[PDB]
Amino acid sequence: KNIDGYFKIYSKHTPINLVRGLPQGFSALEPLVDLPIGINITRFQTLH
Amino acid sequence: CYFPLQSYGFQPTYGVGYQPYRVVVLSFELLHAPATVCGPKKSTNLVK
Ligand SMILES: *[C@@H]1O[C@H](CO)[C@@H](O)[C@H](O)[C@H]1NC(C)=O
């Protein structure tokens, strides 16, 4: 998220065994980090 | 025709005001983006 000029990240890590989909059942993401960057954002791009 | 610079030539014999000084200007901007340099926050011993 990018709100009131801060960019925030939340994240979670889980080992799984479902062959080609997103899992059933519940988990919540703890906050990872917060960045006071003050930049506009409209698009994004993954890296392999 | 003039070269737009002129040199110093600081010698240890020069008088006060005519000697070399090292100078800093401290400058800052306010409220245009989120506050990201600030003074240290003093603290007191914990009471229970
Ligand atoms: C952010 O981008 C939008 C879309 O181009 C623009 O309307 C807005 O003025 C921009 N804001 C800043 C602070 O760059």
Q: Residue A35, SS3?
A: strand
Is residue B4 exposed (0-12), middle (13-18) or buried (19+ Cβ within 10 Å)?
exposed
Give the method of determination: cryo-EM
Tell me, in angstroms, the distance from the centre of ligand 1 to residue B19's CA: 51
β-strand partners of A31 = A10
Tokens of B32: 């245009």
Angle B44-B37-B23 (CA atoms, 0-180°, nearest 5)?
A: 110
User: Alpha carbon A2 to chain centroid distance?
Assistant: 12
β-strand partners of A2 = A7
Decide if A5 and B36 are in contact by the 8 Å CB cutoff.
no
Is A36 near chain B, with CB under 8 Å? yes
CA-to-CA separations, B41 to A33, A48, B10, B16, B44, in angstroms, rounded: 22, 42, 42, 40, 10
Tell me the C-alpha distance between B17 and B10, whole Å. 12
Give the experimental resolution in Å. 2.9
Residues of B in contact with A4 (CB under 8 A): 34
CA-to-CA separations, A24 to A16, A18, A39, in angstroms, rounded: 10, 9, 36
